[PDB]
Paper text:
Aggregation-prone-motifs (APRs) of proteins are short segments, which – as isolated peptides - form diverse amyloid-like crystals. We introduce two APRs - designed variants of the incretin mimetic Exendin-4 - that both display crystal-phase polymorphism. Crystallographic and spectroscopic analysis revealed that a single amino-acid substitution can greatly reduce topological variability: while LYIQWL can form both parallel and anti-parallel β-sheets, LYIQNL selects only the former. We found that a simple change in crystallization temperature or modest changes of chemical composition of the solvent system (therefore the available interaction partners) can prompt formation of significantly different nanostructures: we identified four different polymorphs of the LYIQWL and two of the LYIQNL APR peptides.
Needle-like crystals grew from 0.1 M acetate buffer, both in the presence and absence of ethanol at pH=4.8 and diffracted to a resolution of 1.70 Å and 1.55 Å, respectively. Crystals grown from both solvents contained β-strands of parallel orientation, but arranged in different amyloid topologies. In the monoclinic crystals grown from the ethanol containing solvent system, strands arranged in the class 3 topology could be observed, while the orthorhombic crystals grown in the absence of ethanol contained strands arranged according to the class 4 topology. Similarly to the class 3 structure, hydrophobic residues (Leu and Ile) form a hydrophobic niche in this arrangement too, while polar side chains of Asn and Gln stabilize the interface enforced by H-bonds. The side chain of Tyr2 forms H-bonds with chain termini. Due to the parallel orientation of the β-strands, Tyr ladders with a distance of 4.8 Å between adjacent side chains are formed in both crystal structures. On the other hand, in the class 4 arrangement, the Tyr side chains face in the same direction, so that inter-β-sheet Tyr-Tyr interactions could not form at the zipper interface. Although the Tyr side chains also meet near the chain ends in this crystal form, the interplanar distance between them is 7.0 Å, indicating a much weaker, if any, type of interaction. While the class 4 structure did not contain any solvent molecules, the class 3 structure contained both water molecules and two ethanol molecules, one in a solvent channel near the chain termini and another wedged into the steric zipper interface. The two polymorphic structures with distinctly different topologies are thereby stabilized by very similar interaction patterns.
Residue numbers in the entry:
A (entry chain A), B (entry chain A), C (entry chain A), D (entry chain A), E (entry chain A): 1 to 6
Write the structure that this text describes.
């Protein structure tokens, strides 16, 4: 599970 | 589980 | 579990 | 468990 | 458990 918020 | 908030 | 807040 | 707040 | 607050 990988989450990136940019 | 990887979370990055940028 | 890895969290980075930048 | 790794947390960095920057 | 590693916490850095910068």
């Amino acid at each position: 599970l990988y989450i990136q918020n940019l």
